[PDB]
Structures are given as C-alpha cells and as structure tokens.
Amino acid sequence: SFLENNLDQLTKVHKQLVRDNADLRCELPKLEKRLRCTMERVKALETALKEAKEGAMRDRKR
Amino acid sequence: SFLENNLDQLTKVHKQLVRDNADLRCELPKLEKRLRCTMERVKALETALKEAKEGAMRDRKRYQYEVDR
Amino acid sequence: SDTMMKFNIIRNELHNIMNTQLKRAESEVAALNRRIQLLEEDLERSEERLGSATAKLSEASQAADES
C-alpha cells in the first residue's frame, strides 16, 4: 500500500541502526582503554628517557 | 495526506541517521588501527632506548678508564 | 653511533607521536563518544515517532474497511 512498504522499511532500517549503535557503544570503551594504555606506555617511556639522558649527562660531568 | 508527509519526513531523518551511522562505523575501526600503529612505533622506541642505555654505560665504563690512566 | 644523539632521536620521534597521533586521538575519541550518544538519542526520538505512525497506519487500515 506504499504507506506500508515505506513504514515497513523505516521499521527495518531503524532496528538495524539500533543494533549498530549497541555495537558502537560497546566497541568504543575498548578504544578508550587502548588509547589510555598507549599514552600510559608513552609517558613511562618518556620519563625513562630523561632518566637515561640526564643520567648520561651526569656521567660526562666526571 | 498528513501521514504520508509524516512518513516522508521520517524517511528523511533515517537517511541522515544512516549516513551518521556509516561514518561512525568507519572511524572506530580506523582509530583502533591508528592506535595499533602508534604502539608499534612506541615498541620500536622502547627497544631503541635500551640500545641507547647500554651504549651510555659502555661510555661510562670508558670514561672511568680514561680517568684511571 | 653517538649516545647523546640516540637519546635526542628518541625524544624527537616520541615528540612527534604525542604531538600528532596521540593528541588527535584524544579529541577524536571525545567526539566519537559524543556523536555515538547523540545518534542514539536521535534513534530514541525516532522510535516514538515510528511507534505513533505504526498506530496511525493500522487505524487507517481498519477505517478503510468500514467506509
């Protein structure tokens, strides 16, 4: 009846978007954790670099 | 008819949501890949730091040997 | 190679990682999180309309038989 095919298609696409959103809402925190663990590793590398750089410049001071 | 204008307006809203959803479904896996490629660069940096650290005390035992002579 | 050159090489590349990819990643995850929630809100506003249009079409289907 055209109105029913239009509404039935809107029903079908809306259910697909709802299920896609549930996937997006679950994969996104995993991405936050991965971003948090990456910057944690970068900061740990960065302070270890100053300890080695200044520790190397303390030894040239001899 | 009002209901057909209503459904046509709802159709338009879903067209925008489909494009919004398609964009998000494309950026999230891409960001994981970009984060994965960053961690590979950090791992290479971490091994390059340990190579530099061993090189630094190879120089520290060298300075102590240029002083004991 | 030289030791102090090695440290500054690592510092420079580590600077490029924080200042480009890591910096962009933080504001992108913030936008992505907000866009996902806004889309869901739009979907949640959308269902109420689809639920009302579904009831309106069925009432018209039953009224098309009585006329």
UniProtKB/Swiss-Prot annotation, chain B:
Disruption phenotype: Flies display impaired action potential propagation and neurotransmitter release at neuromuscular junctions, but are still capable of transporting certain membranes, including synaptic vesicles, to the nerve terminal. Composed of three structural domains: a large globular N-terminal domain which is responsible for the motor activity of kinesin (it hydrolyzes ATP and binds microtubule), a central alpha-helical coiled coil domain that mediates the heavy chain dimerization; and a small globular C-terminal domain which interacts with other proteins (such as the kinesin light chains), vesicles and membranous organelles. Oligomer composed of two heavy chains and two light chains. It is found in: Cytoplasm, Cytoskeleton. Belongs to the TRAFAC class myosin-kinesin ATPase superfamily. Kinesin family. Kinesin subfamily. It comes from Drosophila melanogaster. This is Kinesin heavy chain. Kinesin is a microtubule-associated force-producing protein that may play a role in organelle transport. Milt and Miro form an essential protein complex that links Khc to mitochondria for light chain-independent, anterograde transport of mitochondria.
